[PDB]
Amino acid sequence: EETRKIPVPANRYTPLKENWMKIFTPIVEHLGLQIRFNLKSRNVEIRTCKETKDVSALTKAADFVKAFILGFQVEDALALIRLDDLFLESFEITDVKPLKGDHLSRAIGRIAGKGGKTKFTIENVTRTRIVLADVKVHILGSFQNIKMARTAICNLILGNPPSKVYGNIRAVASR
């Protein structure tokens, strides 16, 4: 039998606990897999059981939990369960240009925008889901959608104003 463990950081223990029900149910009723979370090692372990359905989907289940560890909502990770052409791309803001201190914070605020609005706009433009950590940013979507969202994010951290990126990404989505 195969097993796979997913670590849980301390900032994700309470979200994991609070909606644990809608996390362990879609694995045991749909994919027929057998899971637990140990507190001594702080690890969510998934292993296959006897009444397993479609064994070559175990990885998908792991991706489920993995997405919820990165900060994605459980609906988007359940979409990662359903659709097969869904991928995850992660990178740092300083990983493409060195920004230090207040410049880094301003780049984060430019990606987010007021009320998160700019970030939210990009999602509805690209049919993706973006959660950005303290310096990390994660995009969930299909390949070309990831490329479009990465294009918009990289342009926003270049220093291009959010208005121009807003208009250009709407025009690119029109195409």
Binding site: D76, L78, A79, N124, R127
Partner: peptide
């Protein structure tokens, strides 16, 4: 949700539109 958005973009809207057109004694 994400899958709802993808499937809404993958399908075609339909449903309601009222088109108003057109004995005893």
């Amino acid at each position: 949700p994400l899958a709802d958005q993808i499937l809404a973009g993958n399908a075609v809207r339909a449903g309601v539109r009222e088109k108003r057109r057109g004995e005893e004694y």
